[PDB]
Design a protein around this ligand. Structure first.
Ligand SMILES: *[C@@H](CS(C)(=O)=O)[C@H](Cc1ccc(CN)cc1)NC(=O)[C@H](CC(C)C)NC(=O)[C@H](CC(C)C)NC(=O)[C@H](Cc1ccccc1)N=[N+]=[N-]
Lengths: 244, 204, 222, 243, 196, 250, 233, 244
């Protein structure tokens, strides 16, 4: 019958490992590096664009940084198409919660639900897992500023500073070296740019190869504001930090 | 028996010179018994305003539905919805429930952000678009509102003058209806600012 | 409602009134009853207005997809077959009474569809509450081989009969001419014989007439 | 890994071997066929080979009457041919019922090509090892030839040929249209267009035919029909009184 | 509605009026009730216009698919397809259909299908609201193996009386002749048949 | 009977590569060269009509297809896979958008819908990925003019100018030299014909070249007059004559 | 060769054989022997029951389908339960709907068609049991042999299972004798006991070992076990 | 490479379906059966290998009737042949229910043809291990057909399949040449008996039983009937006379 061509995506190895999960994590380790850093007064999302050309339109481009909610945003590492499938369902779940309780969905509940969908493809279905790793930056009135990460296994953890994609071992060592608990967002913006510039496989870190986002509660407002940095805004902050 | 006469309430919209106005009463009732004097019937999603009359459970449901839909719209389009586009969204959403309809009379009011053109629209319970240039009325005192608007209305009224027109059209129509009144609220919508005013009226 | 359809020597013309009613109350004094299925196939609605609007837009959407699939101009028989089979399926619950007309690679056509799914074919047709007033004019002035100008005049006179004599109809006359060789011309408000006279008094209130309890500015920008 | 040649999945080269082998199954019958357009007609000639004496010659056919207007000649095994024939007839009747007018030749071709594309993408449905040539006189396009393959590819033709000796017939027709400068056979009656198709069939293949060696299908305004053995015999007498 | 089909020496002729009414109003006075389901198989429609049009369209679809596979269907086959739709959906349909077709072997045949969904093969059949008034006339005037001229006169005189008494019937008398020669359309105007 | 292929045919290899995607991209590289250039007041998409036979009519096979009156698409790779995607893209423009909002989808969203269909062909049971890359050019009120490239993986990225297929590497390099942010539509068409010439081996005329533009509204292609807001489609396919006139000024 | 084409029943071999069907037939030859034989008035089933241990019971081999029909099994017992239960339903359907006793010939056609469906579809396995169906209908006494391949044959006498060739050769020789045993059930049973003893090799047929069933002209299908088969040993 | 013969719907490098060809081998191994089209009907005949004296004579009927005018005979896997007839009986009943008239033979031939062809399209189903010779009398004359495991069928003057198909086809070809005017129903029954006896030499090791059936317009009123009693013995004697 059809049994002959079955790869068996949801089976254990003799060691107790999940083949497709391990190989999907190997796929992500080649994708552009995404870094999230939590500060006392906000969260910083930074991402390095993989493969760029002179004729690539950057102003309309969005491949790694996505807006799920007015308070929650994500950094993408892996397959862009596979990410958008999960991103769309996450946006629906956020709106389902708001329709049910008349309140914005707490960050963890959205993260857990997406991780459970990723888990589903690991245990049943016979389908390949999503080759995507997310970094969740969000705010709710319970835990305040939160930073999560999720991978093809369906496992999620909280972080003060985390990196996904290429050169994670090098990036995590640099972050663990220069991070402090009383950091400001402006300091966290600088750290993210310094860590990426040192882990870059390319020659120099320019604005056309970067995506930047901050989630801050503006002191002159009292509400949480998301700011996806424009090509010019990334170009400005690149000069101020001392990279040019 | 009639689901459009259990709770009561009225909504009226009017266009002016570079401005639109939408007004509603605050009464929530159960037949003859008055229950609440705070039930607002006008909602907004970005710069587009929507006033809903009829069965209150459906008024709340549709508001939660259109908040749900405009939020997902804003995330995909990367822009706020326009009054013309939202009108079509309401129309298609109501007709989706053709043989099990929401007992409502929705009213869309707003100004297009790109053209600066004033826009108002009305619907029946199954989604037929009534796009009039002058005024749109809905509710238990729709007959009274039609008579007030047809007489008082004149084209190209200034924001300050349009307020007086819509407020007097709402107040006098509500006083001839047993299921309407118990306070009122008027929205004055411009390209840059929107003013919300609570009206002083009879409480009987 | 009052809607008509008249065929002439080189095409077909449809006309309608512009009155929309909620029982005895006029909701829209100038509504568009002439809808477009495809560029050269137009439709006139009668009965449940939401039903006529949605059934025209659904078939119009499917006709466009069929046109792109077949690489051919939409046919009136196709719109007719898709409308009747849809309406028959719902046993007349979708209260859509339509006069469908248009020109295609096969020629000029004029049909009328009822809510239950039944279809008719003729040179002159009428539907709505002013159908009998319109038909009376059509049965008195129609002749074979009409010119474009004669067909517009006959269809316009039929709508006027519905406007003056039927209470469910009034206001303006909308006309759409569809000639075999040319583009379809939609004449919005072809006649306006019902302009409301200037009011005897201006009812502009002096500023500060209405009593206000509370005032605040609404936040629109996110 | 080596199962890329067993099911319809991509090979390292970006090829689909099951589709390629389905093309090879089309020449299993060893039958050649050609299609030409007249001034207001379309004619298909196909080789008729009856090897066994126990066979009923009247039942041996590769030309099908799909609808009143559309006819189809098939190159490939007869079980797959009749599978495509029954489906085309079902699609033709359904189109007329749903859309009120007879399905055009190019539309049916596109529909059958879309179905063939599905077998190219989905694993459980094998491709049909047949090449379908649809012919009719369309009410909008006139005389039409549209041919579909196991790959799901389809295109219109001025004239076409299919079979093991396809290239010999193709180049023969190519050279004629380079000479005539027109894209059709300039002839009023279909009989002479049938005569043209038989003549060029003989010139390309280098073989003479009897009344039982050929199979002819003619498409005219509002009708497609197939010629009997005596109708072909009359056509073979006419070409003999020229050479 | 007044519909009839009469078999004769050379084949069969179908006859119908042109009136469709919505109460007392004549919505269409030039209706064609004689519907083609196959080249030489036609039907007479009575009852609900929406029902009869939908049934006739499905039968025409079935017979077209039949011709593609098995060739020209018989009149009995066409009547069976009509019957299958009428009988199986008897609770939802109001359709009185007379099926009349020409065969080269069977000559002219008539099958009437009343409301219940039964089949009745007859030399001639009358149906519709106006047919009740001509039961006595048709039974006394019908002969088997009449000429084309005689059959046209028989139907013309019968339907004229049916139109005269029945308010639901009227307009013009339409006829379709089915023989080996082909298909012929006939039409008779009020100024002719009213004074018979 | 019944589809027993409920499992994925595309799986992750030990190296992390998705084999069937890589092989689908290989099939695109074998395909005929197609390009797209975005100007200030329009977008142009062009390809070569590689005629499989001189007897075959090249007009009956359109490689450039209209999706909405303002959006067009071109491809490189497997022809049959493109044709079914066009049918799905046209339908999803109505079902997922037009029947809801009463208007046609913006270019970015329709591209996102096409990308979703192609993504599902990578993950769903018993299917292979589409062996095509698409260049979708369109216009909408709030975004202006845009050009997108959709890959077999379902990944899409916006372009100022790009090419896909046989000589895509050589064509993109030439496009990098000639493109600027001040190009007019006529300039973009001129560069398009220059870039495509290097890929074309044989005859280079209006009969062998297929070209379409997304520019100004065409009231003459609307089919009706009377409604002021309706001004016509922005998508326009250039005729064989219109191409030949611009080839003389090469 | 064989290893590549014996994975499932859906696959043919290069020679045109179905090995999964052939492996299912091997399950019969492993099973205990059972003998069927008939005359013009009666039909008899004689079955040798098999025990696992000397502490275990001798597993039943004969199942009653209806008042006029029954069968003996050889091979997988649960597969015989499924097929006998289906035959019980088909005999029941004919009696309730048509008030008609199901013909033994038609009963064989139903078992043939049910076993065939397991040999053409993927996922399914062939039945691993052979059946000997006896019955008295409107056309007299009958005996049928069922095979997992789907093949059903009407026979005067037969035997299936281990060493069943010994009994089959006996019945082929005694053919002219037992076909004429009419109006005497005791002599027909003894002929079947003499048949089953030809297949003996390990032990001799004892009281709790022997199983005999009979159906005929004025005899409803009844199974005799233990004390009731003592006068035949 | 190899392995193209393991799965059903798989095309081999030379465009062949081996699983279908393997099913033909099951037919060739099977018993010989023939069909003769006469002047106003058809005659079917089949060999019945007597395995032992235990087989009850004239009981194990192989030839089957579809509707009341179609006769079917097959060679190879008998259970597969019964499955095809069951489908044909349902297919004939479906035709009569909708169209009133009994199903035409060319119409019935395609119905079996499409059904057998369907079993060559999937790897979840196995091809039929039978070649079926069938036919009868309808509106316009008599018809004879032979259906192959591939789904391929044609009209036949004389059909033969099984163990001794070559000996049968040789005898059938002699009849077509010597009788261009057309054999009669009486003669076809006698001749069918001879052909089976002559084709039995390919299986002369085992004793056999002869079974004949016919459907003639003048002899059986166009209804399928079995040859029994005197006419059967007359045919047996005609064969036993010309075998020596
Ligand atoms: C003339 C039809 S008639 C029946 O011959 O008088 C007009 C036709 C029309 C067609 C298209 C447009 C363009 N959108 C406008 C008008 N028909 C009407 O005026 C109908 C008359 C009904 C059938 C009595 N009125 C309506 O459709 C109105 C729409 C208003 C709000 C613009 N709606 C209704 O009357 C709703 C009917 C209804 C009630 C319960 C369930 C479903 C439908 N009632 N409300 N509200």
């Amino acid at each position: 019958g059809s049994r002959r061509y079955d790869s068996r995506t949801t089976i254990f190895s003799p060691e107790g490992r999940l083949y497709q999960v391990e190989y999907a994590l190997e796929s992500i380790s080649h994708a552009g590096t995404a870094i999230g850093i939590m500060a006392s007064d906000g969260i910083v999302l930074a991402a390095e664009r993989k493969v760029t050309s002179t004729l690539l339109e950057q102003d309309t481009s969005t491949e790694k940084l996505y807006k799920l909610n007015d308070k929650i945003a994500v950094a993408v590492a892996g397959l862009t198409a596979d990410a958008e499938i999960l991103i769309n369902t996450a946006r629906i779940h956020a709106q389902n919660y708001l329709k049910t309780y008349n309140e914005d969905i707490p960050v963890e509940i959205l993260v857990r639900r997406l991780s459970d969908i990723k888990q589903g493809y690991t245990q049943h279905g016979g389908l390949r897992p999503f080759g995507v790793s997310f970094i969740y930056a969000g705010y709710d009135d319970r835990y305040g500023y939160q930073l999560y990460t999720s991978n093809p296994s369906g496992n999620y953890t909280g972080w003060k500073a985390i990196s996904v994609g290429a050169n994670t071992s090098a990036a995590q060592t640099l972050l663990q070296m220069d991070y402090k608990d009383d950091m400001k967002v402006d300091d966290a913006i600088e750290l993210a740019l310094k860590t990426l510039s040192k882990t870059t496989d390319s020659s120099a870190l320019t604005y056309d190869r970067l995506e930047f986002a901050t989630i801050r509660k503006g002191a002159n407002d009292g509400e949480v504001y998301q700011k996806i940095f424009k090509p010019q805004e990334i170009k400005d902050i690149l000069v101020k930090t001392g990279i040019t | 028996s009639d689901p459009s006469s259990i709770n009561g309430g009225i909504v009226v919209a009017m266009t002016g010179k570079d401005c639109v106005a939408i007004a509603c009463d605050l009464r929530l009732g159960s037949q003859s018994l008055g229950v609440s004097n705070k039930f607002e019937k006008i909602f907004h999603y970005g710069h587009v305003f929507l006033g809903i009359t009829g069965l209150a459970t459906d008024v709340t449901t549709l508001n939660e539905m259109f908040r749900y839909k405009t939020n997902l719209y804003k995330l995909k389009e990367e822009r706020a919805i326009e009054p013309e586009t939202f009108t079509q969204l309401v129309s298609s959403s109501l007709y989706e429930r053709r043989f099990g309809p929401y007992f409502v009379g929705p009213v869309v009011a707003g100004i297009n952000s790109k053209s600066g053109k004033p826009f108002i629209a009305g619907f029946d319970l199954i989604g037929c678009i009534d796009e009039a240039k002058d005024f749109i009325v809905s509710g238990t005192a729709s007959d009274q509102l039609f008579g007030m608007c047809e007489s008082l209305y004149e084209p190209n009224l200034e924001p300050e003058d349009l307020f007086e027109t819509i407020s007097q059209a709402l107040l006098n129509a509500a006083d001839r209806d047993a299921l309407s009144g118990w306070g009122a609220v008027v929205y004055i919508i411009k390209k840059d600012e929107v003013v919300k005013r609570y009206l002083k009226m009879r409480q009987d | 409602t009052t809607i008509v359809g008249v065929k002439f020597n080189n095409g077909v013309v449809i006309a309608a009134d512009t009155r929309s009613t909620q029982g005895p109350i006029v909701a829209d004094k100038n509504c568009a009853k002439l809808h477009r299925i495809s560029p050269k196939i137009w439709c006139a609605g009668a009965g449940t207005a939401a039903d006529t609007e949605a059934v025209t837009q659904l078939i119009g959407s499917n006709i466009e997809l069929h046109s792109l699939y077949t690489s051919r101009e939409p046919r009136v028989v196709s719109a007719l077959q898709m409308l009747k089979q849809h309406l028959f399926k719902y046993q007349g619950h979708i209260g859509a009474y339509l006069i469908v007309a248009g020109v295609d690679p096969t020629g000029s056509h004029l049909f009328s569809i009822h809510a239950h799914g039944s279809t008719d074919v003729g040179y002159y047709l009428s539907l709505g509450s002013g159908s009998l007033a319109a038909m009376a004019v059509l049965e008195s002035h129609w002749k074979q081989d009409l010119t474009k100008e004669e067909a517009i005049k006959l269809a316009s006179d039929a709508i006027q009969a519905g406007i003056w004599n039927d209470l469910g109809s009034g206001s303006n006359v909308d006309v759409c001419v569809m000639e075999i060789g040319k583009d379809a011309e939609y004449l919005r408000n072809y006649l306006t014989p019902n302009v409301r006279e200037e009011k005897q008094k201006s009812y502009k209130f002096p500023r500060g007439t209405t009593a206000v309890l509370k005032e605040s500015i609404v936040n629109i920008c996110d | 890994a080596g199962y890329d040649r067993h099911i319809t999945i991509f090979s390292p080269e970006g090829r689909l071997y099951q589709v390629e082998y389905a093309f090879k199954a089309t020449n299993q019958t060893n039958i050649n066929s050609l299609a030409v357009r007249g001034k207001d007609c379309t004619v298909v000639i196909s080789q008729k080979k009856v090897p066994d004496k126990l066979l009923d010659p009247t039942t041996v056919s590769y030309i099908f009457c799909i609808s009143r207007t559309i006819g189809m000649v098939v190159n490939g095994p007869i079980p797959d041919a009749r599978n495509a024939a029954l489906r085309a007839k079902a699609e033709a009747a359904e189109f007329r019922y749903k859309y009120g007018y007879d399905m055009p030749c190019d539309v049916l071709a596109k529909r059958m090509a879309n179905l063939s594309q599905i077998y190219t993408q989905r694993a459980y449905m094998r491709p049909l090892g047949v090449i379908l040539t649809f012919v009719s006189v369309d009410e909008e396009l006139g005389p039409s030839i549209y041919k579909t393959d196991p790959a799901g590819y389809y295109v219109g033709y001025k004239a076409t040929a299919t079979g093991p000796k396809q290239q010999e017939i193709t180049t023969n027709l190519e050279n004629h249209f380079k000479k005539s400068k027109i894209d059709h056979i300039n002839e009023e009656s279909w009989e002479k267009v049938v005569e043209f198709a038989i003549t060029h069939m003989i010139d390309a293949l280098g073989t003479e035919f009897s009344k039982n060696d050929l199979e002819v299908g003619v498409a005219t305004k509002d009708k497609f029909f197939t010629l009997s053995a005596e109708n072909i015999e009359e056509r073979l007498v006419a070409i003999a009184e020229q050479d | 509605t007044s519909i009839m089909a009469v078999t004769f020496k050379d084949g069969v002729i179908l006859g119908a009026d042109s009136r469709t009414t919505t109460g007392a109003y004549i919505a269409n006075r030039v209706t064609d009730k004689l519907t083609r389901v196959h080249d030489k198989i036609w039907c007479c429609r009575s009852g609900s216009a929406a029902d009869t049009q939908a049934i006739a369209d499905i039968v025409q679809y079935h017979l077209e698919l039949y011709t593609s596979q098995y060739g020209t269907p018989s009149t009995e086959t066409a009547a069976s397809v009509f019957k299958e739709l009428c009988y199986e959906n008897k609770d939802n349909l109001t359709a009185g259909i007379i099926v009349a077709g020409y065969d080269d072997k069977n000559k002219g045949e008539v099958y009437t299908i009343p409301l219940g969904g039964s089949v009745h093969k007859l030399p001639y059949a009358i149906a519709g609201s106006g047919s009740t008034f001509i039961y006595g006339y048709c039974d006394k005037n019908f002969r088997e193996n009449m000429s084309k001229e005689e059959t046209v006169d028989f139907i013309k005189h019968s339907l004229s009386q049916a139109i005269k008494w029945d308010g639901s019937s009227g307009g013009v008398i339409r006829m379709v002749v089915l023989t080996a020669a082909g298909v012929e359309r006939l039409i008779f105007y009020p100024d002719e048949y009213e004074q018979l | 009977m019944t589809d027993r292929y409920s499992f994925s045919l595309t799986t992750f290899s030990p190296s992390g590569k998705l084999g069937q995607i890589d092989y689908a991209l290989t099939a695109v590289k074998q395909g005929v060269t197609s390009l797209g250039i975005k100007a200030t007041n329009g977008v142009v998409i062009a390809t070569e009509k590689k005629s499989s036979s001189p007897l075959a009519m090249s007009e009956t096979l359109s490689k450039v297809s209209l999706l909405t009156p303002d959006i067009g698409a071109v491809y490189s790779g497997m022809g049959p896979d493109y044709r079914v995607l066009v049918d799905k893209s046209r339908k999803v423009a109505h079902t997922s958008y037009k029947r809801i909002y009463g208007e046609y989808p913006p270019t970015k969203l329709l591209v996102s819908e096409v990308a979703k269909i192609m993504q599902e062909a990578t993950q769903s049971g018993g299917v292979r990925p589409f062996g095509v890359s698409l260049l979708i050019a369109g216009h909408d009120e709030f975004n202006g003019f845009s050009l997108y490239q959709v890959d077999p993986s379902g990944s899409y990225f916006p372009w100022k100018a790009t090419a896909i297929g046989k000589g895509s590497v050589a064509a993109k390099t030439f496009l990098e030299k000639r493109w600027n942010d001040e190009l007019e539509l006529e300039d973009a068409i001129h560069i398009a014909l220059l870039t495509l010439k290097e890929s074309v081996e044989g005859e280079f005329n209006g009969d062998t070249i297929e070209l379409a533009i997304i520019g100004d509204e065409n009231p003459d292609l609307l089919g009706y007059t009377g409604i002021p807001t309706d001004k016509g489609p922005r998508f326009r396919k250039l005729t064989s004559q219109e191409i030949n006139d611009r080839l003389e000024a090469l | 060769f064989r290893n590549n084409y014996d994975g499932d029943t859906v696959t043919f071999s290069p020679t045109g054989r179905l090995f999964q069907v052939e492996y299912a037939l091997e399950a019969i030859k492993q099973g205990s022997v059972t003998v069927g034989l008939r005359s013009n008035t009666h039909a008899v089933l004689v079955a040798l029951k098999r025990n696992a241990d000397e502490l275990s019971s001798y597993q039943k081999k004969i199942i009653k389908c209806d008042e006029h029909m029954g069968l003996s099994l050889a091979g997988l017992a649960p597969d015989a339960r499924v097929l006998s239960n289906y035959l019980r339903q088909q005999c029941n359907y004919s009696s309730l709907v048509f008030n008609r006793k199901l013909a033994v010939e038609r009963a064989g056609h139903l078992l043939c068609d049910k076993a065939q469906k397991n040999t053409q579809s993927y996922g399914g396995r062939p039945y691993g049991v052979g059946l000997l169906i006896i019955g008295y209908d409107k056309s007299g006494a009958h005996l049928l042999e069922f095979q997992p391949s789907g093949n059903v044959t009407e026979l005067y006498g037969t035997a299936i299972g281990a060493r069943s060739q010994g009994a089959k050769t006996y019945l082929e020789r005694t053919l002219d004798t037992f076909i004429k045993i009419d109006g005497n059930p005791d002599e027909l049973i003894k002929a079947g006991v003499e048949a089953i003893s030809q297949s003996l090799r390990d032990e001799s047929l004892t009281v709790d070992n022997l199983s005999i069933a009979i159906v005929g002209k004025d005899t409803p299908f009844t199974i005799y076990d233990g004390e009731a088969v003592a006068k035949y040993i | 490479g190899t392995g193209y013969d393991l799965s059903n719907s798989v095309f081999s490098p030379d465009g062949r379906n081996f699983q279908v060809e393997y099913a033909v081998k099951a037919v060739e191994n099977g018993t010989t059966s023939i069909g003769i089209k006469c002047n106003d009907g058809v005659v079917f005949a089949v060999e019945k290998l007597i395995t032992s004296k235990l087989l009850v004579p004239q009981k194990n009927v192989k030839i089957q009737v579809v509707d009341r005018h179609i006769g079917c005979v097959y060679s190879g896997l008998i259970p597969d042949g019964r499955h095809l007839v069951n489908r044909g009986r349902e297919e004939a009943a479906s035709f009569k229910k909708l169209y009133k008239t009994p199903i035409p033979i060319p119409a019935f031939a395609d119905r079996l043809g499409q059904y057998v062809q369907a079993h060559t399209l999937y790897n979840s189903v196995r091809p039929f291990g039978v070649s079926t010779i069938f036919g009868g009398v309808d509106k316009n004359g008599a018809h004879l057909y032979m259906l192959e495991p591939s789904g391929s069928y044609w009209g036949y003057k004389g059909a033969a399949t099984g163990k001794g198909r070559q000996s049968a086809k040789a005898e059938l070809e002699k009849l077509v040449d010597h009788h261009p005017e057309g054999l009669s129903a009486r003669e076809a029954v006698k001749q069918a008996a001879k052909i089976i006896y002559l084709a039995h030499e390919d299986n002369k090791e085992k004793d056999f039983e002869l079974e004949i059936s016919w459907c003639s317009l003048s002899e059986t009123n166009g209804l399928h009937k079995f040859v029994k009693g005197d006419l059967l013995q007359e045919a047996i004697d005609f064969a036993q006379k010309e075998i020596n």
